[PDB]
Design a protein around this ligand. Structure first.
Ligand SMILES: CCCCC[C@H](CC(=O)NO)C(=O)N[C@H](C(=O)N1CCC[C@H]1CO)C(C)C
Ligand SMILES: CCCCC[C@H](CC(=O)NO)C(=O)N[C@H](C(=O)N1CCC[C@H]1CO)C(C)C
Ligand SMILES: [Zn+2]
Ligand SMILES: [Zn+2]
Lengths: 189, 193
């Protein structure tokens, strides 16, 4: 299995190429997709973009399970509208917002280990693309799944969350629960 | 007991530090805080520190770049960075202003953000007014790397870390430090001067 690439490797900071839709069902593409799923599950995390395994192509994978969700208190889960959703694989995804509604919550990236910051994201998204077998799909999501989708689509444009985080909120994981500083906007919606 | 360095997320690092009363500077209380800063800076080792970094909400900075630290970096980088040695310096209530429009872009790390670096745009030439550790009124004119350290430390005093003013797409792990800058990132270096 490929290792998860860390901030600084130019593949993370460069625009990824679209995959020919007619090649999505090939061996090479199908292995990359399978690798992504194994790596996401081994971390574990709720999403992965192909550049994070060294692949300059427009492919994301993502899932959130009852198990992952059981690590967080019910209060957090509620505020975050965080809900289980099946393994999704999107090739050449194009995200657009469904409205102008945003929420502000703490995010971490497997390519930036030991840190988090508060990031503003649209609550409601639609993402068009192809699935794992090359079939055109449209995905509408709200809450936490929406957030994950923007996180992962970001990676495909060479964008990490550190370059769009709320100022003064960046922090170690051990400092996650400390208050927000004077002037930071409150968390939530 | 020596203070530990405070890490990103602790509010003292993200909020504006208060002035030292100039009449208080020569007191044992403030002198101990200064001595603690110098010792924490040296232990690290690093080239500067701000009081919020040892959990003290005061406008105090220390800095030091010795011939021995400098002796480790490549000769080429020292030239480009205009990185010159300078004796230990303490400033209480520092007030920083640029002396021109000339800037430079190089990599920085912060003791408060362990394990990462990023490209940060700084002024080449600055003047800093304040008080020395005896509470005497001073002015320091700095350029090059020393001007850079002064800017990073003064920023800490207003609740500002480099991560919130870094060139997009350059944040990296220390281990990935020397990997190529991505397409569209400005090159490292400075304005002619
Ligand atoms: C919300 C935005 C989605 C971020 C997705 C990231 C993974 C990533 O870097 N994707 O590109 C993640 O899983 N981060 C982790 C995460 O969110 N996890 C780990 C497993 C379950 C879930 C919540 O704890 C850690 C680093 C916090
Ligand atoms: C360049 C702008 C000023 C840097 C000041 C920082 C320390 C800090 O966070 N001060 O508030 C530092 O010393 N950082 C270290 C540093 O610059 N060092 C450590 C020892 C010598 C010198 C060059 O390697 C590391 C993180 C690189
Ligand atoms: Zn990520
Ligand atoms: Zn610092």
């Amino acid at each position: 299995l490929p290792e998860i690439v860390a901030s600084g490797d130019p593949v993370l900071h460069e625009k990824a190429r679209e995959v020919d839709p007619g090649e999505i069902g090939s061996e090479r593409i199908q292995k990359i997709i399978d690798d992504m799923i194994k790596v996401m599950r081994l971390a574990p995390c709720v999403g992965l973009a192909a550049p994070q395994i060294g692949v300059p192509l427009r492919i994301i994978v993502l899932e959130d399970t009852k198990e992952y969700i059981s690590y967080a208190p019910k209060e957090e889960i509620l505020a975050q509208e965080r809900r289980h959703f099946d393994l999704m694989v999107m090739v050449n995804p194009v995200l657009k917002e469904r409205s102008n509604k945003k929420a502000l919550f703490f995010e971490g990236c497997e390519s930036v280990d030991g840190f988090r910051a508060a990031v503003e994201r649209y609550l409601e998204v639609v993402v068009t693309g192809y699935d794992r077998q090359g079939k055109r799909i449209e995905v509408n999501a709200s809450g936490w799944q929406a957030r994950i989708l923007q996180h992962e689509c970001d990676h495909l444009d060479g964008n990490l969350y550190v370059d769009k985080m709320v100022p003064r909120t960046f922090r170690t994981v051990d400092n996650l629960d400390l208050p927000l500083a004077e002037g930071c906007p409150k968390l939530g919606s």
